Amino acid sequence: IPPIPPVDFAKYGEIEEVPMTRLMQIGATNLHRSWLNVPHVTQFESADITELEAFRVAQKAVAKKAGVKLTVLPLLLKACAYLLKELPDFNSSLAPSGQALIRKKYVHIGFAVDTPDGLLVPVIRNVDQKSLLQLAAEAAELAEKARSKKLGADAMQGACFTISSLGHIGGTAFTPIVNAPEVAILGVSKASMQPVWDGKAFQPRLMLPLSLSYDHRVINGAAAARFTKRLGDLLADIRAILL
Amino acid sequence: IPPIPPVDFAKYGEIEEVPMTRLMQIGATNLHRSWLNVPHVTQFESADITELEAFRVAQKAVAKKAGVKLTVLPLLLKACAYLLKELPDFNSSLAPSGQALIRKKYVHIGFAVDTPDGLLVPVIRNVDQKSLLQLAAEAAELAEKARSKKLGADAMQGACFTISSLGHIGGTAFTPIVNAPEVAILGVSKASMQPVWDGKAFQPRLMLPLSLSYDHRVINGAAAARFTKRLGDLLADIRAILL
Amino acid sequence: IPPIPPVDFAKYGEIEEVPMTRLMQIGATNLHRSWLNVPHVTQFESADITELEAFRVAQKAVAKKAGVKLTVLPLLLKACAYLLKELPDFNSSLAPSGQALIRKKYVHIGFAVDTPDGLLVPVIRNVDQKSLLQLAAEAAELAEKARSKKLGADAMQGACFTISSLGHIGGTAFTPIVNAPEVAILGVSKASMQPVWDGKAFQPRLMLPLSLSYDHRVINGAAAARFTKRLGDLLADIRAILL
């Protein structure tokens, strides 16, 4: 792969060399290994979370009595675990012989935490088996452990899918990079009030933007549009997870 | 190109190996060969098809009397063939000497059909010369042939451009991968009612989302925005194809 | 990197070979070198420029008295220079030892001009130090020099960031390719009137679509969402540049 010509950057003005933490360099290498290895496609969709938000906000009492803050993330984690069980090609990996996929029978999901030294993706194990407030607490713990360099590498391992949420900073949608050997990563952005046709007039609904990137070798376009559609359906009525 | 480290996936839970059809493996290889070879950009645009939909729906009688179902696809095929004639760099390919483009003087277009064994892209030849109901029928035939493994490889050959339509499952936009040695692929998603400024108030218009990925080596950014703009214009009034 | 199988294209119809200008071939090579080398992500955002447009239009008198046309580009250039100073990782480059970043202490920005022979990206030096009408004039000069093959290669050098504006042709958003060894490129598309929730009803605001692609090795997802958010904030009130 042809390298970039070196440029003498100080010919154009003052420069200064800051160095990279080992975590950024590790990060850097893994992403470039994902990028050259995975033919990426991104599927955009946005979900109606007007009702999910109201749920979230009404349960602020309960959540505080349990010491967890309830955010959208445990609600995202729960719906994607249901779905990763319904559509198992998403919960799997290409075997190194290129000719089989390892379907994992377990659901562990990581999520991106951006710390000072770099990106960490702590994994929550068997997300399918935990409740909203369990997930809430654990997510929170692992994030502080991650910020405070106290996350032992055991916890960065063997995830089946990654969620990257930037809803807290902003943006309309992005195209995340798959953490190979996983096969898909959900990027989530800022929710906004949007007019939505109700058959007669435009209603304001709160809409969460979602960006699913996938490994096109394993997941085709119709499988991915069916996954973000189902996910949009589950987030608009989380009670469907009950049945 | 550095390979992905092998992970022992059964350390984290129960796994199961399902194998890949030869069609998926073929599929897989061709996409990775496209991905490493084509510097991709995706241009998003959305077109006003309120009038095209009404046309489509009013001609349901005619279409049934001819045995074809009229969908948006023959209407997409016709407009892109007009346009592939107007903007010939889109209907062409990079010569293997990297220093010339083969402009094709013919317009054959394929479209993605996702079958059980994998993705097939049957080609309709000389789309420029067929009418809406001819195109309607043929598309339909090739798709059933494709589902039923009866599509002879002659029909997967020598296309100039690909349309991938996921409007039937959902999604807001995606970033398709170019089927090299073609130079562009139109991805089409779900149409929705959207408010559109009429200079004075917001009108509800039915808007089709379009995602053109292209080979940035051959097509520059301004050529691609001019192609989806023209396409948006042609779909809002298909009568412009007449003149 | 596996090559594309050669196809005999004249088996399917009449072909014609047109050749590539040296500028397209140069262009072609640089993009493929960027693509294989940079793990790309694109961050979408859109900014409220209703007030910026009114400013622009009210100062048409002044601009004409100075001989410059005031467009959105000098306003984009100014806000990104402020911001490139606030978020210096965006104004920097990966050292060839892969383990340090060269932070540039200067702000020179290029912008894409698509000419007949190919894409040129003239650079305006020390954009941070020039005013709106200086920037206006210079941009304009360099563009005509670029169209007329009179741009000496000195002017295509040592830029820290690229803006590619296609707002003049159309489109909703695109995913530009980073001009390595730069680390980010802002793509800008067509502004449209959009309903925006004001807490009580939907107001029509003029919204500029922005698409920031970045080198994920150097910039993480949260840094990029913070850059397009800040940029959206600066374009909605350019007076913040004053303080």
Side-chain angles (χ1 to χ4, degrees), chain A residues 1-21 23-59 61-63 66-68 70-98 100-143 145-149 151-243, chain B residues 1-21 23-59 61-63 66-68 70-98 100-143 145-149 151-243, chain C residues 1-21 23-59 61-63 66-68 70-98 100-143 145-149 151-243:
Chain A
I1 104 177
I4 306 299
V7 180
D8 188 337
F9 291 116
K11 302 186 186 241
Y12 306 105
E14 232 275 87
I15 57 168
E16 170 193 36
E17 300 144 83
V18 300
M20 240 157 86
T21 59
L23 227 187
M24 267 166 259
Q25 307 178 241
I26 292 299
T29 305
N30 284 303
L31 297 160
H32 197 200
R33 196 228 299 291
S34 290
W35 180 254
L36 292 171
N37 254 98
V38 186
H40 295 79
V41 181
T42 306
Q43 173 70 56
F44 296 110
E45 185 48 285
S46 35
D48 193 336
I49 50 155
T50 313
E51 282 303 300
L52 233 212
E53 197 66 352
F55 176 66
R56 229 209 79 223
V57 139
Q59 304 297 317
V62 179
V68 298
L70 185 63
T71 53
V72 85
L73 216 230
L75 294 154
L76 243 11
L77 291 168
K78 250 274 158 282
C80 294
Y82 182 82
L83 253 185
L84 236 33
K85 287 251 176 88
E86 192 196 296
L87 299 166
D89 295 342
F90 275 91
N91 188 27
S92 76
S93 290
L94 207 64
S97 57
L101 300 60
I102 292 153
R103 252 134 78 149
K104 296 180 206 185
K105 300 290 216 165
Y106 53 102
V107 186
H108 314 155
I109 296 158
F111 58 93
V113 184
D114 280 288
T115 82
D117 268 29
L119 182 77
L120 285 186
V121 182
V123 179
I124 299 180
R125 305 286 168 103
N126 307 288
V127 171
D128 54 317
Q129 280 156 32
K130 297 176 182 177
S131 58
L132 298 175
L133 296 181
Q134 288 184 69
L135 292 166
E138 204 172 340
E141 166 195 298
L142 287 179
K145 277 156 163 54
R147 279 177 208 120
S148 306
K149 300 103 194 302
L151 201 78
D154 172 56
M156 255 97 62
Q157 264 129 248
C160 318
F161 178 88
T162 297
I163 298 180
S164 189
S165 192
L166 296 169
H168 56 102
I169 299 160
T172 267
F174 57 120
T175 51
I177 288 181
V178 172
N179 297 302
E182 289 166 50
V183 123
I185 169 166
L186 221 211
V188 182
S189 295
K190 220 211 190 79
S192 321
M193 211 80 207
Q194 295 303 314
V196 176
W197 188 244
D198 76 301
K200 208 76 188 188
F202 289 107
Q203 261 25 297
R205 298 326 241 73
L206 181 65
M207 296 274 125
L208 182 59
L210 302 160
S211 312
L212 181 76
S213 294
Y214 47 102
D215 180 341
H216 204 352
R217 297 173 306 185
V218 177
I219 275 115
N220 49 308
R226 199 166 297 285
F227 185 97
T228 49
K229 197 241 182 60
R230 277 295 277 140
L231 176 65
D233 288 345
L234 294 172
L235 292 188
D237 205 358
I238 196 79
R239 300 178 290 200
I241 273 170
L242 257 17
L243 99 172
Chain B
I1 104 177
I4 306 299
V7 180
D8 188 337
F9 291 116
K11 302 186 186 241
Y12 306 105
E14 232 275 87
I15 57 168
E16 170 193 36
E17 300 144 83
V18 300
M20 240 157 86
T21 59
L23 227 187
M24 267 166 259
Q25 307 178 241
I26 292 299
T29 305
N30 284 303
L31 297 160
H32 197 200
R33 196 228 299 291
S34 290
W35 180 254
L36 292 171
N37 254 98
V38 186
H40 295 79
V41 181
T42 306
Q43 173 70 56
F44 296 110
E45 185 48 285
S46 35
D48 193 336
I49 50 155
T50 313
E51 282 303 300
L52 233 212
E53 197 66 352
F55 176 66
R56 229 209 79 223
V57 139
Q59 304 297 317
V62 179
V68 298
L70 185 63
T71 53
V72 85
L73 216 230
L75 294 154
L76 243 11
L77 291 168
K78 250 274 158 282
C80 294
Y82 182 82
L83 253 185
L84 236 33
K85 287 251 176 88
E86 192 196 296
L87 299 166
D89 295 342
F90 275 91
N91 188 27
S92 76
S93 290
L94 207 64
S97 57
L101 300 60
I102 292 153
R103 252 134 78 149
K104 296 180 206 185
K105 300 290 216 165
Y106 53 102
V107 186
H108 314 155
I109 296 158
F111 58 93
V113 184
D114 280 288
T115 82
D117 268 29
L119 182 77
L120 285 186
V121 182
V123 179
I124 299 180
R125 305 286 168 103
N126 307 288
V127 171
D128 54 317
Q129 280 156 32
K130 297 176 182 177
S131 58
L132 298 175
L133 296 181
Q134 288 184 69
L135 292 166
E138 204 172 340
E141 166 195 298
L142 287 179
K145 277 156 163 54
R147 279 177 208 120
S148 306
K149 300 103 194 302
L151 201 78
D154 172 56
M156 255 97 62
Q157 264 129 248
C160 318
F161 178 88
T162 297
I163 298 180
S164 189
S165 192
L166 296 169
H168 56 102
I169 299 160
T172 267
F174 57 120
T175 51
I177 288 181
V178 172
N179 297 302
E182 289 166 50
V183 123
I185 169 166
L186 221 211
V188 182
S189 295
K190 220 211 190 79
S192 321
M193 211 80 207
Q194 295 303 314
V196 176
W197 188 244
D198 76 301
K200 208 76 188 188
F202 289 107
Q203 261 25 297
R205 298 326 241 73
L206 181 65
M207 296 274 125
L208 182 59
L210 302 160
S211 312
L212 181 76
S213 294
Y214 47 102
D215 180 341
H216 204 352
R217 297 173 306 185
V218 177
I219 275 115
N220 49 308
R226 199 166 297 285
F227 185 97
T228 49
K229 197 241 182 60
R230 277 295 277 140
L231 176 65
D233 288 345
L234 294 172
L235 292 188
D237 205 358
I238 196 79
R239 300 178 290 200
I241 273 170
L242 257 17
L243 99 172
Chain C
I1 104 177
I4 306 299
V7 180
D8 188 337
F9 291 116
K11 302 186 186 241
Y12 306 105
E14 232 275 87
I15 57 168
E16 170 193 36
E17 300 144 83
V18 300
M20 240 157 86
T21 59
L23 227 187
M24 267 166 259
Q25 307 178 241
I26 292 299
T29 305
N30 284 303
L31 297 160
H32 197 200
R33 196 228 299 291
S34 290
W35 180 254
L36 292 171
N37 254 98
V38 186
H40 295 79
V41 181
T42 306
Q43 173 70 56
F44 296 110
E45 185 48 285
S46 35
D48 193 336
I49 50 155
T50 313
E51 282 303 300
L52 233 212
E53 197 66 352
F55 176 66
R56 229 209 79 223
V57 139
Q59 304 297 317
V62 179
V68 298
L70 185 63
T71 53
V72 85
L73 216 230
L75 294 154
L76 243 11
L77 291 168
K78 250 274 158 282
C80 294
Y82 182 82
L83 253 185
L84 236 33
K85 287 251 176 88
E86 192 196 296
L87 299 166
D89 295 342
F90 275 91
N91 188 27
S92 76
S93 290
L94 207 64
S97 57
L101 300 60
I102 292 153
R103 252 134 78 149
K104 296 180 206 185
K105 300 290 216 165
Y106 53 102
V107 186
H108 314 155
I109 296 158
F111 58 93
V113 184
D114 280 288
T115 82
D117 268 29
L119 182 77
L120 285 186
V121 182
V123 179
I124 299 180
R125 305 286 168 103
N126 307 288
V127 171
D128 54 317
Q129 280 156 32
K130 297 176 182 177
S131 58
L132 298 175
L133 296 181
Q134 288 184 69
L135 292 166
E138 204 172 340
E141 166 195 298
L142 287 179
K145 277 156 163 54
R147 279 177 208 120
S148 306
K149 300 103 194 302
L151 201 78
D154 172 56
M156 255 97 62
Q157 264 129 248
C160 318
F161 178 88
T162 297
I163 298 180
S164 189
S165 192
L166 296 169
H168 56 102
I169 299 160
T172 267
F174 57 120
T175 51
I177 288 181
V178 172
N179 297 302
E182 289 166 50
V183 123
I185 169 166
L186 221 211
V188 182
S189 295
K190 220 211 190 79
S192 321
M193 211 80 207
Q194 295 303 314
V196 176
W197 188 244
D198 76 301
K200 208 76 188 188
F202 289 107
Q203 261 25 297
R205 298 326 241 73
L206 181 65
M207 296 274 125
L208 182 59
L210 302 160
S211 312
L212 181 76
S213 294
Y214 47 102
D215 180 341
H216 204 352
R217 297 173 306 185
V218 177
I219 275 115
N220 49 308
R226 199 166 297 285
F227 185 97
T228 49
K229 197 241 182 60
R230 277 295 277 140
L231 176 65
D233 288 345
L234 294 172
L235 292 188
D237 205 358
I238 196 79
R239 300 178 290 200
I241 273 170
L242 257 17
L243 99 172

